[PDB]
Amino acid sequence: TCIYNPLFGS
Amino acid sequence: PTEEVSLEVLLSNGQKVLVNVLTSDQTEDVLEAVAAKLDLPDDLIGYFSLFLVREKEDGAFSFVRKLQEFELPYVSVTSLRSQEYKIVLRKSYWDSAYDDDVMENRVGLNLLYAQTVSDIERGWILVTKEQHRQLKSLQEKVSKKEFLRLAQTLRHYGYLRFDACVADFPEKDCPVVVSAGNSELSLQLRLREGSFRVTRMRCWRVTSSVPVRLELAFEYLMSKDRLQWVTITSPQAIMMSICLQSMVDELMVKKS
Numbered sequence: 001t002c003i004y005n006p007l008f009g010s
Numbered sequence: 011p012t013e014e015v016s017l018e019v020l021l022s023n024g025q026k027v028l029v030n031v032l033t034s035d036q037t038e039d040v041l042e043a044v045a046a047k048l049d050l051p052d053d054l055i056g057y058f059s060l061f062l063v064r065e066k067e068d069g070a071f072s073f074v075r076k077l078q079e080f081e082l083p084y085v086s087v088t089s090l091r092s093q094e095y096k097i098v099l100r101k102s103y104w105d106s107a108y109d110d111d112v113m114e115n116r117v118g119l120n121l122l123y124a125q126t127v128s129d130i131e132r133g134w135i136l137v138t139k140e141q142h143r144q145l146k147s148l149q150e151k152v153s154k155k156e157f158l159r160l161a162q163t164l165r166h167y168g169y170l171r172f173d174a175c176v177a178d179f180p181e182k183d184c185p186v187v188v189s190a191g192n193s194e195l196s197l198q199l200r201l202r203e204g205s206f207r208v209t210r211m212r213c214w215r216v217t218s219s220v221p222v223r224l225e226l227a228f229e230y231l232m233s234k235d236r237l238q239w240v241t242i243t244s245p246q247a248i249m250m251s252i253c254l255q256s257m258v259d260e261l262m263v264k265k266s
Contacts, residue, residue, distance in 0.1 A: 001215060002214065003213055003214065003215070004212065004213050005212055005214070006258065006262065007208065007261055007265075008209065008210070008211065009209070009212075009231075
């Protein structure tokens with residue numbers, strides 16, 4: 001579904 | 011079927027650039043044709059993209075999408091069956107540092123100048139009375155390097171503004187102005203403001219109704235260990251999503 005953000009959390 | 015056509019691509023100031031291409035030419039091919047027509051160096055092509063936009067009565071542009079690699083721009087626009095849609099050439103990077111590369115070339119510089127001027131004219135860029143005086147002076151004086159150097163310091167230089175829409179943060183059906191740039195979404199509540207850092211978005215999703223209405227929802231880290239979905243309802247939801255992706259991409263290239 002929702003595409004994960006590779007930069008998330010940093 | 012492969013056949014040759016004339017394509018109008020608009021620049022930021024509304025000047026029309028006409029190129030000869032094939033119906034079966036893809037986005038990159040058309041882009042290259044435009045760049046060739048303008049005498050833009052090959053080494054700057056990667057700094058610009060073609061966008062599909064809708065032109066409103068007042069001449070302002072609502073950005074619909076960035077044309078992808080596999081697309082056939084003639085088909086893309088004609089198949090929409092509306093003369094309101096136009097192909098636009100515009101810079102496609104986010105960090106204004108790249109302006110340095112573009113400004114080394116006269117044609118590149120002209121393009122950047124044109125779009126900055128239009129950004130100010132349409133009220134995307136926020137300036138003070140004094141800055142407005144100076145800017146208005148360089149415009150007459152056309153130094154442009156100095157004009158751009160000034161523009162780079164202006165609020166929301168390098169941001170994309172979207173048409174007024176609504177979001178469910180902080181309250182349901184709140185009217186908002188969204189702008190994307192500098193690795194964030196700026197939400198102006200038209201006045202209070204919010205800044206949603208891209209690095210704090212776990213993901214995003216573009217959704218559409220059924221029994222039209224398009225939404226972009228991102229799952230935002232509102233504080234430590236607390237995730238909350240934020241939903242913006244906008245016909246430009248896809249363009250916003252493309253921007254989020256684009257900003258992330260630029261960050262990946264930079265990080266590497």
